[PDB]
Amino acid sequence: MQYTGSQYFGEYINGRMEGSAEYILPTDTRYIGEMKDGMFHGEGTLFFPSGSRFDAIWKKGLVVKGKYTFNDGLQYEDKHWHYCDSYDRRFYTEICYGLKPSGISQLTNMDPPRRIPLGYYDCGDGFYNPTTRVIKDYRNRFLRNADDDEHEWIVRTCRKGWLPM
Amino acid sequence: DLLFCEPTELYNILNQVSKLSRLAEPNYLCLLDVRSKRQYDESHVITALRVKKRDHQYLIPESVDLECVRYCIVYDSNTPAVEFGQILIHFTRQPVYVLRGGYECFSGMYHFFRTQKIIWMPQELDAFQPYPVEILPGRVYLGKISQACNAKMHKDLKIKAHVNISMETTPYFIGNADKLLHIKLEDSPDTLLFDYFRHICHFIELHLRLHSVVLVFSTRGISRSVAAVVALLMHYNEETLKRSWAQVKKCKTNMRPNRAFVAQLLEWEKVLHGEYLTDISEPIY
Amino acid sequence: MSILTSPRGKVEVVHCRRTESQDIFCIKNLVRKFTQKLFGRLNIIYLLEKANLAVTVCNDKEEIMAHSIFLDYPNWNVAKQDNWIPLFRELDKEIPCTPLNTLFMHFFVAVDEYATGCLKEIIRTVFKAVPELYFIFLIVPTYLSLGSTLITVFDQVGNIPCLNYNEDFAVHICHRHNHYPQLHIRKARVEDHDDLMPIFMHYDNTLKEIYGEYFLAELIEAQDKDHHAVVCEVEGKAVGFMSVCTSVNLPLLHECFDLGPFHGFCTPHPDDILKPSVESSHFRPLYLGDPIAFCIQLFCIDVLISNVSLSLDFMSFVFSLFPGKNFCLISVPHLTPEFVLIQNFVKVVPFNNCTLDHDLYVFHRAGLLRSITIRLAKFLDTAGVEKLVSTLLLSTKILDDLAQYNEAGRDPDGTALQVFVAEVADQIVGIAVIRKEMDIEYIRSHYNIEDFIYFSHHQQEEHGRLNHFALNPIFRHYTKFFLKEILRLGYKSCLYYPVYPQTREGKLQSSYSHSLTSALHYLVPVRPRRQIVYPLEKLGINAPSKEVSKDQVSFALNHTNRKLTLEPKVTVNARIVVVGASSVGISFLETLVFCSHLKFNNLTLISTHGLPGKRLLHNEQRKFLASDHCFNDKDYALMSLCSWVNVVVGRMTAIDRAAKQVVVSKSEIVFYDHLILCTGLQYQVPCPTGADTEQHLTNREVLELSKQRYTGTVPSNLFILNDEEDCVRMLCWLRNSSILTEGKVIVYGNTLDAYTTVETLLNIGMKGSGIYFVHPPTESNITCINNNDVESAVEDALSAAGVTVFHDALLAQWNHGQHPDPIYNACFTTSTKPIRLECSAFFSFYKKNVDYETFKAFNDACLVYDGRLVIDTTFHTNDIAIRAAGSLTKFSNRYYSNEWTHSNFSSKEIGFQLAAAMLSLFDPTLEPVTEPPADLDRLIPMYKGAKIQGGILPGSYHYLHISKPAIPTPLNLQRSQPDFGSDVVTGNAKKGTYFRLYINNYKLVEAITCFSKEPFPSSNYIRLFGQHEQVLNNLCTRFDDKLIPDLYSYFTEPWCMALFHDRFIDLKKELRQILISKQEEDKPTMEEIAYRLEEEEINLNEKPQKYLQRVFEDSIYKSLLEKSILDYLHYNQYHLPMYAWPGII
Amino acid sequence: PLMKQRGFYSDILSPGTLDKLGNVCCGPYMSQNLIRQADLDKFTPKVDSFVIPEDFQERVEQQIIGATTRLLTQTDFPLQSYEPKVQVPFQVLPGQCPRKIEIERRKQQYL
């Protein structure tokens, strides 16, 4: 446990763990899991530091699974993903509700309505300006910086905090 | 014993190479972001651990032999790092270096170093592959041929110029006479590159005026390109040979011409200055 | 040792000794802020790790406090490793300071009162060690005076600024002559004799006992032009004597020694018959000039430490008296150590069958010169080196590379290339050619370089590796310094050298090999490692980083690094002789190679074929002979013993103790000063019973005859196979013969070797109907497998092949009474019936024995022989000077243990401990040890090194069996007895999937038996031996509770790999030692608690495991073992991609 | 058992005898270790290729230090004048002390 930070709540045999259990990993990831021989030997779900869920089934202490779901509960495909795309460009809440229940300007990814404050952009996590090559976090502190390739991607693809025309 | 280090040096050292990536030995490097976990999740430097803070004390990351980890580095976003710089002064056999522009310009010039992957396992570190190296700050790069071909490396620096002295073909700018410079000869000492240096320097300079992004190579990052950089620096700054050589020595520590090329550079110096200002009798050439 | 009194009047006595790492902790505790003004931001580890010398002084009570570190360049950046000589001469043009004669200090501390004495003693020690060190330079920032302590020794000299700043440094100097004089030399006088006479008599009586007391005086009187005598003087008194003579009986030397390098011992003469027109080994260079060497022929000197430098100085004056003579010779009788004077000399090489009563040493007039200097390659060197290398084998390659680097600044690929020449009196005689390594990680995985570096303070930038290095050998004595300067100039810490197996490719010396000249003397041999077998397909990324994983053309590693570069590494001249290798002997040679403290010079191996493992076999040849798995081709390549081991081919044919000589047949003589006998047991001819099936006797009659030796002629179609050379001989003969196509062949003997032969022949392709296999009943009814299930599996495989199987039989006569060579038809007796068989060829594995020839050679020796060779439990024969080990050996009946023998144990453990014993006679660095107490004579001490047998088996199975040493006992007898063991077994032998272990009721593992059609990781499984079921992941429950599917796959899992890792066993030693530590005032150790609980010293209602485990987990000791493990993971993680500690995160 | 010590001197160089061993080249045919082969003639260069540097004086110049006794010992006193009278002949019988020894001993006793 201590030497990496791992945590477990369950049963012990010979001093090594054999359990149906909830669990924490020094990612500060949470997990629910079954164990054998002091190893995971279970079908179990991994709850992110960001809450979202990965799933892990264990064969002889190795993983063989596919499922993901976001922390909002959006169900996801790692392949072909049919979402907000050619069949319909609607977000998770906009597909579930349709028109968001009262049509608040959150017919868009984040609102109530405002300009992006600093300048910069929206790319969901962070504000970034192509005139500064800096990303920022929604507390207006900072995020990873980016040269030409990512700068050019942001410049074309997403929404600047231009002045609201 | 706390010192300022330019981000260009970070890009030199952290993708320094010598057969191996130097990242595949820990005594080479340590780098320890004191700041939030959440920033580190969003990314970090290309071996940079996440610091643990506890009741505003830092929990020593003895991930490595801190006693002698020869290069020893810290960054905040900008320049709580400073006090970590202070504490470190007790430790390493070398002085301890702060990364001027801890994040903002260094990755703003080179995004790719950001990544959500934390450790790179010893196989994965050893398997690493270098980005091109930077000679003239922000403006001209140095590369080995398989870097110069590497699609991602070429694209990510938004590059279009080649500058090379070699026989061996490369995939891009074929016949683009103004956005390709290529010369052909062996690294043989009778290759009288002296004249070609003037053309090379003027071509690079023109891309400076154009702000074109330029890579230099001599197949292996070896020798011809090194002499051409000596000529370029001496003519660009009216510097002595010894100054340009000292800069080149760090630029990539493998860089080295040959003794006939040394003679050519000595004549380049005597042509620019009018006389020899550097004495070749030392072994440091 | 020296006496020092504190100003308090307390007295201490002190010794100086060369630092050992445990000292570092103590010394670092001494360090002071005052000292940090001198050398602050020193952390000792770095400076020691780069050190040129670490020196400690310590008191009789082992209070450690006096230390200094010295290097070949200054502190405080006042100059550079690049250069400093001009700048210091700019301080004082008169100071001859150069890397020949100069070192700087960089640290000291001591407890003050003793400290002032200790500093003086340390200074004296250093000047006594390193005679050209005429000065020590000491440098401080100008704002500091040295103050009393150092002022007692160092004097002040013109200052140097900081190389950078307006910050000045002041320079202070200490003089050798102030703290250790030169000599004074004068040509002897009669008065001088009386001083010296007690010195000789202290050394020896014998000369006086011939000559009478005034011999030295008469010799002093004797002198003339042909013989001068000369002495050193101090305190107005003599204490050294040296004799020289002009005469040298050149015909002797010209026969005895290859003066190819040393034409100069003669003048030139225009016939120069220096070459012939194996006869080259017979050839002798016919010099036709005149004797221009002279000898020294008497020497003693002593205050004794005064000898060390001053002996060298004698050579200078001696040469002055012989204007006509330029070489000095001295002949040195065996067993005599190289005292200082000789060490400077080159050791001459005797010819390919020289035998002399002496070893011979050379030194030359030029050695006196001191303009020896290094410089890095420039043009003019080409002419000098061309003149130099003209006899060098790869002279062309070396020249071409020197020219290349003079053009290129690089090697052809582009990587670092460095070339160095030695310049002398404006003349050249040195060349070195060195390359910069990058497979340093491959080195570190293959060899224990870590024994001599703390690698993590070094860096991948810092390593040189040699390729070519050749010299005027006279300079070779200086050359150890030459390596120091090479390392400084190249900015490298290490030089590495790779010795490449001398079999090479079947013809090619592949270019990985290097043309090594003299350097091999100065390096050290590095103990070989053992990689774990990695299940890389279960690992992917998590492999050992693939460079380490690689195979490479397997070779031995030799090394030097700066801290070594002073150690004289005192040679041993003793002729130590080791006889045979079968089953065992190599282990002794390994230990004597693998101890850098010493340097064996006369050691020689005698064997039927010399070295083991010569041949590039292909594995089917190995299929013939069942193996102990303790050695293989790559092991022999790594051990590379030939590098130092001298080898003679063919076994030995008589002992003769009175000479202390041994015969190889045809009167070819070797002489020994210690004799170690290790022939192993060997097969002997399967003697026909003589009494026949055709004679229908009762079997016990024939059984008595079957014991007897054979003494008839030997069948050309009968085979005895002790060795790989025998196997190849037989196999080539078979390939050149019909029988493999068609014949009917007997393999006889119930030993595993038969089954291995049978499988081998099935691999070669003989039809199983071809194969006939007869296995007589034993004197004790333990099968050669003791596993009836696997035996039955093999027997069914033999049935499917159609091998012809015969229990109970005994060998009635092939060819009956007809001429035996070749065999054609054979008879076998039985409990009920005659047998006849058709036998194109006959293979024996009937009984191993001492060889008749060598048995006789022993009995001629009148070494005690009781059918097997008799020793005490400390290897002494009836000769104090002759010792023996291995299954050919047996103890006196008084031990009452004629069942228990060296046969029982591992080979390696035997050789290792035998060498450890014999080292105590050779090694000066451990104290010399007494002969055994009789109390040891009471007993055979319980070794534990498990004994390995392993085999491939009919129908292409693999087989491996490992044992605790025991008197045999049947499997079913032990299993039916309750008072033994729990067993653990996952298997079906016929299905080719089989493990058996036995665990002992002490819950350790003390058996293996595995049977396989899979290439098992035997190296890993051997570590399973002796392991507790807990260590095997509480294995017992895993066997009980249907948890293991099978053993082989389960050991793949990563946790076991540490259990395979060699350092982990020593970590287990550490962990026990930690439990041995006593942590708290109230507490016994965890060990003492266990001792109480297990011995009923405490009595319980819970079973002891529960109480002990609870008390441990409650106790703090758990944290200490856990922390220790995590630390070891840190170090070992370089080797191992699967262990979690802070460092993963 | 076995020792390491002697009077530490040479012998077999003596011109007087190639005799007592008879054939010295009488051993088995050697197969040397590697290390001496690396020392041997094909790995090494020969002394006659090496330069003979010029001068004895260069060696004397390379000397560095003042010897032990040479100077402080100096005095005005005549040395032979120290010598006691004693009547021992010039040419003692072998096994007797030669004359000069007696002089040293007597004077040293007197001092």
Side-chain angles (χ1 to χ4, degrees), chain A residues 26-28 49 125 133-134 142-150 152, chain B residues 37 42-43 77-78 103-104 107-111 114 155-158:
Chain A
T27 312
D28 295 352
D125 59 342
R133 294 160 169 269
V134 168
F142 207 88
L143 282 184
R144 71 194 173 260
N145 318 86
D147 99 284
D148 305 9
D149 167 54
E150 178 151 29
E152 184 156 72
Chain B
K37 164 178 158 62
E42 296 334 297
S43 168
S77 38
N78 306 89
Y103 212 169
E104 47 79 60
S107 68
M109 285 300 295
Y110 329 106
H111 74 299
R114 35 68 305 178
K155 182 266 289 172
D156 283 0
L157 292 176
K158 212 180 196 180

Side-chain angles (χ1 to χ4, degrees), chain B residues 158-225:
Chain B
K158 212 180 196 180
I159 273 176
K160 42 174 71 175
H162 271 190
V163 178
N164 167 60
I165 309 94
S166 98
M167 307 308 299
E168 323 81 39
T169 52
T170 70
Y172 305 119
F173 312 116
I174 300 162
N176 183 333
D178 301 345
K179 273 178 171 171
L180 172 63
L181 159 58
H182 173 208
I183 296 151
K184 285 178 176 180
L185 240 166
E186 300 198 349
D187 225 292
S188 191
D190 42 2
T191 296
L192 304 189
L193 201 64
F194 187 178
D195 317 56
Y196 307 77
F197 296 143
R198 180 139 293 289
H199 183 192
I200 291 158
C201 297
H202 193 55
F203 179 96
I204 292 170
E205 279 178 54
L206 175 58
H207 292 305
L208 310 184
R209 300 168 216 152
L210 293 169
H211 320 288
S212 324
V213 207
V214 185
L215 181 66
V216 186
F217 57 101
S218 65
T219 325
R220 305 108 76 181
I222 37 159
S223 173
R224 285 148 299 169
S225 53

Side-chain angles (χ1 to χ4, degrees), chain C residues 1030-1049:
Chain C
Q1030 322 127 343
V1031 174
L1032 305 187
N1033 179 264
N1034 274 251
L1035 175 61
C1036 286
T1037 68
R1038 307 301 94 170
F1039 180 54
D1040 301 333
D1041 302 322
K1042 312 175 187 174
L1043 309 181
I1044 280 163
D1046 63 75
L1047 289 155
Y1048 294 85
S1049 59

Side-chain angles (χ1 to χ4, degrees), chain C residues 182 214 233 247 252 260-261 296 337 352-353 355 358 370 471-472 476 516-518 521 601 642 646-647 669 922, chain D residues 4 10-12 15 24-25 28 30-36 38-39 41 43 45-47 62 68-69 95 97:
Chain C
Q182 279 291 316
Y214 310 122
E233 182 197 87
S247 191
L252 177 67
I296 284 163
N352 308 298
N353 89 330
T355 61
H358 303 78
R370 295 186 162 194
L471 201 88
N472 171 355
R476 196 212 197 146
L516 181 57
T517 302
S518 289
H521 267 43
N601 195 306
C642 58
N646 300 279
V647 183
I669 321 185
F922 322 144
Chain D
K4 293 178 174 180
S10 75
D11 43 14
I12 51 159
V24 171
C25 308
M30 181 50 63
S31 72
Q32 288 85 350
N33 61 29
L34 185 61
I35 187 164
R36 279 192 273 277
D39 288 358
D41 179 69
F43 287 89
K46 302 195 292 98
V47 56
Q62 279 166 7
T68 50
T69 52
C97 298

Side-chain angles (χ1 to χ4, degrees), chain B residues 107-160:
Chain B
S107 68
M109 285 300 295
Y110 329 106
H111 74 299
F112 76 78
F113 295 83
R114 35 68 305 178
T115 179
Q116 305 199 255
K117 182 160 179 170
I118 304 189
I119 67 166
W120 296 67
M121 266 289 285
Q123 182 60 35
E124 308 185 316
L125 285 167
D126 190 356
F128 196 76
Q129 62 198 348
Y131 272 71
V133 165
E134 185 173 309
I135 30 185
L136 302 189
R139 287 185 291 166
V140 189
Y141 291 79
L142 192 59
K144 73 168 182 178
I145 185 159
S146 65
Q147 300 181 286
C149 304
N150 179 289
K152 187 168 182 177
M153 294 176 207
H154 172 206
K155 182 266 289 172
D156 283 0
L157 292 176
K158 212 180 196 180
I159 273 176
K160 42 174 71 175

Side-chain angles (χ1 to χ4, degrees), chain B residues 34-35 50-59 80 83:
Chain B
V34 299
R35 303 176 299 129
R50 188 186 47 65
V51 177
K52 304 159 192 167
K53 206 183 193 201
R54 185 169 182 177
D55 298 347
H56 295 285
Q57 250 292 17
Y58 305 110
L59 301 179
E83 54 180 16

